[PDB]
Design a protein around this ligand. Structure first.
Ligand SMILES: O=P(O)(O)OC[C@H]1N[C@H](COP(=O)(O)O)[C@@H](O)[C@H]1O
Ligand SMILES: O=P(O)(O)OC[C@H]1N[C@H](COP(=O)(O)O)[C@@H](O)[C@H]1O
Ligand SMILES: Nc1ncnc2[nH]cnc12
Lengths: 169, 176
């Protein structure tokens, strides 16, 4: 986990003043360009979950649109578990639960009592992750943990969430 | 490919009148809920590419935001190749190429990062569905601006009556 995290940190590309003046953007897309690095990202999350939840079966990975889609499904398939998306309003068909930060999840996707991990690339304010948490609770599912790639500590994003949080980098 | 395609077709969930009246929405999300079905989706695309391109190395899978992100990266990793996203305007950092495409009541824009794909790279473009072809066509224009080679479009589904492939100038494979 530690050695993989160092190599993944070196792959990040910094972009000052994006999306606006004064903001320092950390781009994780170079990881996905290299199948060696991408495999290390997946392996590192897999290792964490096996360490944190050795005798608890995970039923689904719940990934946030959009950058949570880049690694969430791949992590799910590596674990042998299902993937379910949380999407922006009006994107998902059928009957959905809603949560304002608006995010949606499909009512038929996750049975009550399911154990889930929520995944996304970065946590900033925590508003998006918090909304996803509310959708999981509306499904009567269990939120074991939030898994992020990166975290902006100064923004205190964790304070909005009421389940444990792991950040890889 | 054929037997996997049948089981994947049965997993699709139809939603009439979404997002608006008269449109029939085909939801492929139930495939991703079942790791058995998801693996079959990936294996089926892998098999196709090995059959279509036995002695041509693929350098990257290029996936369209958002539903192309659901399987594109996983397909790339299964093939041992890179993944690069095509995103909506203003989302990607750094220097980007741009390509415009039309929607119902407007023109929207796609982008790709200039440093992502070297000139001469062989690429496959992937997305969930082709309807009008406008999004796929825009992605094609971004690939050509990188001076990369567009070997094929791979889609999960295709709306034949819309004639989406007529807007594209590279070969097209649709799994279902
Ligand atoms: O580009 P978007 O408007 O969809 O924002 C995406 C980003 N916002 C979230 C982090 O921000 P926050 O909700 O403040 O924690 C993540 O989903 C991250 O990918
Ligand atoms: O997210 P959007 O509202 O832009 O729509 C996404 C969907 N439309 C595209 C297909 O439509 P078209 O460009 O007409 O072929 C696909 O990317 C599919 O995922
Ligand atoms: N019928 C349809 N179902 C799902 N996505 C689409 N995008 C354009 N047409 C569509």
């Amino acid at each position: 986990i530690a050695s993989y995290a160092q190599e993944l940190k070196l792959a990040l590309h910094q972009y000052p003043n994006f999306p606006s003046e004064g903001i320092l953007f950390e781009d994780f897309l170079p990881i996905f360009r290299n199948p060696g690095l991408f495999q290390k990202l997946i392996d590192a999350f897999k290792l964490h979950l096996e360490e944190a939840f050795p005798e608890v079966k995970i039923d689904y990975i719940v990934g946030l649109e959009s950058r949570g889609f880049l690694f969430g499904p791949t992590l799910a398939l590596a674990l042998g578990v299902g993937f379910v998306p949380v999407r922006k309003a009006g994107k998902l068909p059928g009957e959905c639960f809603k949560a304002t930060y608006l995010f949606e999840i499909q009512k038929n996707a996750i049975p009550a009592g399911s154990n889930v991990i929520i995944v996304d690339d970065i946590i900033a304010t925590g508003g998006s992750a918090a909304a996803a948490g509310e959708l999981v609770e509306q499904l009567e599912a269990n939120l074991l943990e939030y898994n992020f790639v990166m975290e902006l500590d100064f923004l205190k994003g964790r304070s909005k969430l009421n389940a444990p949080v792991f950040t890889l980098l």
